[PDB]
Design a protein around this ligand. Structure first.
Ligand SMILES: Nc1nc(N)c2nc(-c3cccc(Cl)c3)c(N)nc2n1
Ligand SMILES: [Zn+2]
Length: 287
């Protein structure tokens, strides 16, 4: 019965982050559950405080989790955040690893907006993937949150807006399955690459699986990914998915994406399909 100082008592492991795991906590003062991350103070390169600072900078944005506390306690740096609902990977598995197009579109609208918002705060996420999007609880059950800023990087100076310099020979950060082509080529990640990754996430949700799943391991995914044309990958699915991916791959390193354009592609498709904008996801139809 490990206790994070007075305030919180730790519970089971619930998650796996880019640096360190996530535990269920109880706030003793509140009669309330929370999510807790721990870092040994002796860690060679501490990042827990650094990551909390990002969350705090972002606070108030739609779909950004709130940090309850960040501090040192005994031999650990601790981050406590508000508890959220399941990740989209978790939900994918409950929905037979296939989402309806309606669900995909409702998600793609929110997810594009979260990536826009982070970019508005001068950061890129760099690990866009299903596991890093979580649904809210209660009244926020309809809301998609983005999480985990452990691989996040500032892409421009906050005052001047000077963009980070172009570089090559970078080792890959984030999941290779959803990595952009340029990431596989060693190019420094920029705003383009968050969006491209999301496009593979979206097709992943459409397909159940990507062609580069389940095949030096890197060189293999990179090959298959570069060897599959977007036309091929998206075949049988509305052209918008391929238009999305093409647009992202066209963007130059420091280019600002047109987020509206990409949201509009999907809004218009949504309209042509006659779906209700009621935020009824596939998992809400489960019973
Ligand atoms: N159900 C739930 N709630 C959360 N709030 C949560 N949070 C994270 C996360 C990621 C990075 C940093 C921190 Cl503190 C938490 C995670 N991996 N899983 C989570 N699962
Ligand atoms: Zn701190």
């Amino acid at each position: 019965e490990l206790r994070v100082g007075n305030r919180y008592r730790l519970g089971r492991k619930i998650g796996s982050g880019s640096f360190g795991d996530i535990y269920l906590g109880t706030d003793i003062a509140a009669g309330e559950e929370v999510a807790i991350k721990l870092e040994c103070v002796k860690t060679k390169h501490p990042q827990l405080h650094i990551e909390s600072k990002i969350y705090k900078m972002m606070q108030g944005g739609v779909g950004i989790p709130t940090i309850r506390w960040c501090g040192a306690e005994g031999d650990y740096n601790v981050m406590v955040m508000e508890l959220l609902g399941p990740s989209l990977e978790d939900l994918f598995n409950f929905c037979s690893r296939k989402f309806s197009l309606k669900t995909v579109l409702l998600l793609a609208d929110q997810m594009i907006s979260r990536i826009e918002y982070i970019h508005s705060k001068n950061f890129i996420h760099r690990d866009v993937k299903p596991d890093n999007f979580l649904m809210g609880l209660g009244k926020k059950g309809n809301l998609v949150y983005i999480i985990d800023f452990g691989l996040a990087k500032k892409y421009r100076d906050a005052r001047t807006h000077q963009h980070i310099p172009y570089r090559e020979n970078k080792n890959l950060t984030g999941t290779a399955r959803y990595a952009s082509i340029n990431t596989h080529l060693g190019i420094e990640q920029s705003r383009r690459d968050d969006l491209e990754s999301l496009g593979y996430v979206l097709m992943y949700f459409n397909l159940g699986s990507l062609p580069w799943q389940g095949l030096q391991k890197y060189e293999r995914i990179s090959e298959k990914k570069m060897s599959t044309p977007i036309e091929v990958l998206c075949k049988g699915y509305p052209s918008e998915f391929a238009t999305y991916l093409n647009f992202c791959r066209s963007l130059r390193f420091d280019d600002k994406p047109d987020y509206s354009y990409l949201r509009q592609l999907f809004r218009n498709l949504f309209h042509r399909q006659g779906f209700s904008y009621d935020y009824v996801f596939d998992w809400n139809m489960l019973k």
